[PDB]
């Protein structure tokens, strides 16, 4: 069930997606996702359904009732779906597939046909909606960032560095910056559109922040737009500031022992409405809850039987 202002779920390789709440770390509902693994899951902004996307299908799971089955399934693509998302009023789906495409879907059982396709020469790894719900970022395995506006049908392509695949990109809800990470850990931050009027979409490279010697897998802002957390394959999650882009906080799950040899990577993270407590998904068969100030963990959920690669954490707007 999901009749609560805050919700939390994780997904991975154990063929289940777990829902729980951060009161005592006990699971509420284990929804059965079989025949594939979940790349990414997202909850609907009306807080009625959740969506798990992995390997050629997007499965909806109901939140108000107790149903372990995929009520609505979307198929048609031929490979994986890296990331999905919805309009903030629940009108259209932006889904980035593994093969070559970033497409739109219509959520109503009617012939509206607001669905378009965007085709590039590379397998795409990340999609990100603009906070004004007008533009969209595509990030692929050739290091290219396709700024595609849904009003027109022409798209900008930007290459900071070729020969390296970029993995994630995100824009803070205050619309201040745009950061992105690649497969060597470099995190470039361009200044986004300042042209609120007619969507001119000018970008100037502000900084590149060199960290994360291993692969950097996900970078996300905060809703307060004062912090930015990024997770990397050296079993670390580091939160930086937006003032001078220095290191605010460092978190690690490393045991300090040479007998483990990277027992689990840092796959995903998310902020809260206060930007005070974060929830992190590591591949050590459990998820953690940390604070952005004291450094030490505050909570743990270890009900999974395999690694987990994606997690969803939304709460109420007040915070």
């Amino acid at each position: 069930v999901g009749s609560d202002p805050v919700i939390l779920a994780t997904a991975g390789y154990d063929h289940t997606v777990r829902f729980w709440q951060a009161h005592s770390g006990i699971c509420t509902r284990t929804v059965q996702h079989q025949d594939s693994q979940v790349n990414a899951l997202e909850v609907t902004p009306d807080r009625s359904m959740i969506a798990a996307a992995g390997y050629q299908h997007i499965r909806m799971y109901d939140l108000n009732s107790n149903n372990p089955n995929p009520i609505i399934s979307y198929d048609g693509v031929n490979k994986n779906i890296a990331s999905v998302g919805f309009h903030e009023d629940g009108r259209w789906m932006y889904t980035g597939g593994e093969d070559c495409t970033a497409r739109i879907w219509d959520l109503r059982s009617r012939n509206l046909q607001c669905q378009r396709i965007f085709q590039v020469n590379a397998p795409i790894n990340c999609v990100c909606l603009h906070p004004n719900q007008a533009e969209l970022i595509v990030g692929d395995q050739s290091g290219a960032i396709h700024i595609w506006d849904l009003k027109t049908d022409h798209n900008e392509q930007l290459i900071p560095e070729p020969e390296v695949s970029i993995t994630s990109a995100h824009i803070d809800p205050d619309a201040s910056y745009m950061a992105a990470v690649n497969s060597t850990g470099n995190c470039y931050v361009w200044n986004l559109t300042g042209g609120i009027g007619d969507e001119v979409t000018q970008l100037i490279p502000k900084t590149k922040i060199p960290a994360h010697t291993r692969y950097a897998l996900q970078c996300r802002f905060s809703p307060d737009s004062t912090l930015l957390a990024t997770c990397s394959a050296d079993q670390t999650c580091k939160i930086w500031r937006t003032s001078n882009f220095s290191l605010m906080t460092e978190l690690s799950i490393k045991s300090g022992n040479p007998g483990e040899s990277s027992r689990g990577w840092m796959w995903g993270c998310a902020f809260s409405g206060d930007s005070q407590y974060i929830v992190t998904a590591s591949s050590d068969n459990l998820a953690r809850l940390w604070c952005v100030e004291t450094g030490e963990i505050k909570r743990e959920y270890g009900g999974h039987q395999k690694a987990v690669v994606c997690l969803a954490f939304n709460d109420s707007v007040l915070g």
Binding site: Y13, H15, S36, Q37, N39, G54, Y55, N80, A82, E98, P123, N125, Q141, S165, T167, Y215, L217, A233, W265, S283, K306, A307, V309
Partner: peptide, 15 residues
């Protein structure tokens, strides 16, 4: 470690 090995993405298969 992962039963659906041939169906992962590139980064998961790398891990």
């Amino acid at each position: 470690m992962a039963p659906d090995y041939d169906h992962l993405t590139l980064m998961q298969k790398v891990e």
